Amino acid sequence: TETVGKFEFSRKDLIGHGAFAVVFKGRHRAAHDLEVAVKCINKKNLAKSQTLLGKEIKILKELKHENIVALYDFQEMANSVYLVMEYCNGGDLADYLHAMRTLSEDTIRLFLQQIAGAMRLLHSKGIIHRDLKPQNILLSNPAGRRANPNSIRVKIADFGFARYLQSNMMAATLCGSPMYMAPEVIMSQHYDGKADLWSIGTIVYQCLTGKAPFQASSPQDLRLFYEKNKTLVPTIPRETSAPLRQLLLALLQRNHKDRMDFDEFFHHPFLDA
Numbered sequence: 001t002e003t004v005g006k007f008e009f010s011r012k013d014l015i016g017h018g019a020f021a022v023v024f025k026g027r028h029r030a031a032h033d034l035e036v037a038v039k040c041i042n043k044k045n046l047a048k049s050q051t052l053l054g055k056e057i058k059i060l061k062e063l064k065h066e067n068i069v070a071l072y073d074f075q076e077m078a079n080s081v082y083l084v085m086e087y088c089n090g091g092d093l094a095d096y097l098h099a100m101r102t103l104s105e106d107t108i109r110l111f112l113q114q115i116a117g118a119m120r121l122l123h124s125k126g127i128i129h130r131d132l133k134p135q136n137i138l139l140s141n142p143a144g145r146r147a148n149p150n151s152i153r154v155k156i157a158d159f160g161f162a163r164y165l166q167s168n169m170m171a172a173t174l175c176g177s178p179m180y181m182a183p184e185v186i187m188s189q190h191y192d193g194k195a196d197l198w199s200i201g202t203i204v205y206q207c208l209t210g211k212a213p214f215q216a217s218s219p220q221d222l223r224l225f226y227e228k229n230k231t232l233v234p235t236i237p238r239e240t241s242a243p244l245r246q247l248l249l250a251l252l253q254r255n256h257k258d259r260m261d262f263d264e265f266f267h268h269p270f271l272d273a
């Protein structure tokens with residue numbers, strides 16, 4: 001049994017194993033019914049794991065929001081780093097959208113309204129996430145067993161690649177997940193917060209179809225694909241409502257100049273609200 005502050009955990013219940021973090025379920029030492037997820041270093045990738053978990057602490061200690069997985073406490077030392085996080089009891093969006101055989105437009109609206117709320121906070125704080133994908137959107141239902149799925153709340157996780165970006169500057173670090181990366185990122189160009197909006201477009205597209213909007217055999221294929229094709233148009237099911245289709249096309253603009261910006265996203269009628 002390992003302890004971090006007022007919390008405890010063990011390697012008994014593995015929530016997830018990643019290259020740069022291992023996550024175990026734990027609990028409050030006094031209030032046992034308070035569940036937590038504890039992120040720990042992956043010692044097989046010690047340096048990078050330590051770096052990413054440290055970065056995540058720096059960003060999350062500044063981000064309190066329902067739709068961002070909460071950081072309850074943390075413990076950073078020279079040779080170990082732990083994050084004690086809110087436990088999300090619904091698994092991830094990658095699994096859910098697949099189990100449901102894609103999601104209804106009403107459910108997509110419900111989830112996207114929540115993601116938009118979290119993104120409003122990120123944008124106001126000058127923070128870009130850079131690894132948005134359905135695997136990093138977690139579900140949690142505050143109600144009891146067998147509760148209505150309309151009560152599902154979604155929360156953005158895994159801020160290890162996040163950074164502050166000053167509003168007159170651009171970022172250029174290649175990071176993220178290739179299938180969800182904006183074209184300008186995977187082409188090693190400069191980018192800003194609109195890269196996250198592309199990623200959000202890909203999340204919405206996957207919720208609708210089950211698949212990524214642009215299929216290439218590989219990341220190099222995907223990159224060559226963006227380089228060779230100046231106008232990208234994703235295959236969207238014909239029965240999709242016109243406003244959801246328009247939102248998707250606006251977010252999935254190849255050229256970031258033409259891509260939907262934050263104000264346009266926040267106030268898009270599909271999200272009304």
Ligand SMILES: Nc1ccc(Nc2nc(Nc3cc(C4CC4)[nH]n3)c3ccccc3n2)cc1
Pocket residue numbers: 015016017018021023036037039069085086087088089090091092135138157158
């Ligand atoms: N870094 C990381 C992110 C997501 C996962 N996957 C995950 N995560 C679950 N809950 C989490 C996780 C967290 C903090 C975010 C790590 N809080 N709550 C979960 C709950 C029920 C069933 C499957 C689940 N799968 C693993 C590691």
